[PDB]
Amino acid sequence: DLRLHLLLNTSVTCNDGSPAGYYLKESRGSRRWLLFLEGGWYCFNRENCDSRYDTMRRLMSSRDWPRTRTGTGILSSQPEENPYWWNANMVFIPYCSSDVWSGASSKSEKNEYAFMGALIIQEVVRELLGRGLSGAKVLLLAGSSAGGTGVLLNVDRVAEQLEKLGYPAIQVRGLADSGWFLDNKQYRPTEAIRRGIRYWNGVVPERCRRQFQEGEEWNCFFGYKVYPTLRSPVFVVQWLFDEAQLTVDNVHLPVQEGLRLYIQNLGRELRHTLKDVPASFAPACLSHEIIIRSHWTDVQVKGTSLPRALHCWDRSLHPLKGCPVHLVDSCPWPHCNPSCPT
Ligand SMILES: O=C1CN(C(=O)COc2ccccc2)CCN1
Ligand SMILES: *[C@@H]1O[C@H](CO)[C@@H](O)[C@H](O)[C@H]1NC(C)=O
């Protein structure tokens, strides 16, 4: 069980002004720290956020959060469930800012909601330094879905924050799960992100911002465009036929030729964007499943599981015989990999 701590700086808030926070389980015999960002879409205007507040309020407020949560998958402390990092210090950061972890805007007389995702990450890091993070050797910033995109937007800022605070020995790395999307043509989204950035006062990594310039920061929410600008090591996990990608593409699964070609082209394009990503795990599956699920160990690419690939990545940051880190399926249709989830 991970225990809840509400932020001591109560000006760093969820959407409705309640304090943000984190769940923590310490492991005093370990110098490894895993900070995981939750996902759950976003909202981009007053009316859309009001609807989310009625029926997804835990994603907008801490008022009803439980005092504990169970760590599962990569957050589990059991070796059988988590062969990778079972002995690590574990942190789960709830997503209560509805801004893909990009915002830096407080509630005020002109803003009904606060969008503070980027500041929540910074304040969690600062408060953890007094609870053992000051002695860390590795800080892995991980996340799923909107949290996976959040890793790409925030990993370099965490590295810069720790350097400026006086902790240059902590190696900051990222793990982005299910947050690598394509701005492709639909079978039958970029505008919502553009509007969101203005509504949230959203921030993007500085090198990417300088490439795309004013008004075009939305480009930095797409992994294939932001990843080449990042300095921290980042491991990318992405299903080739991600269900959220298909949803935004208006695809809902007797498949005729037009849809067959569309699905095959999508897998080929995703595979192409990962060609120059040396640490990656991309199975040919139709799924919405994420790395905090208990059975995350089951899927394999070319005979190698994700916990193994992550271990090989750790070794590479000290190619390796029998320990691969670039694992992208080449077969062209959902479930052509026999180990895909059901
Ligand atoms: O499959 C899912 C989808 N979810 C997401 O957050 C979608 O991912 C993103 C990533 C970036 C921006 C918007 C959405 C959570 C619920 N289960
Ligand atoms: C609390 O956080 C806000 C936003 O980052 C910051 O302006 C303020 O200085 C912080 N307060 C303290 C006491 O650190």
From Swiss-Prot:
Induction: Up-regulated in hepatocellular carcinoma (HCC) with high intracellular beta-catenin. The active site is at S145, D242, H288. The keyword Transmembrane does not apply. One of its GO terms (cellular component) is endoplasmic reticulum lumen. Its main location: secreted. The keyword Secreted applies. It comes from the Eukaryota. It is found in: Secreted. Keywords: Glycoprotein, Hydrolase, Phosphoprotein, Secreted, Serine esterase, Signal, Wnt signaling pathway. Belongs to the pectinacetylesterase family. Notum subfamily. This is Palmitoleoyl-protein carboxylesterase NOTUM. The chain holds residues 88 to 451 of 496 of the full protein.
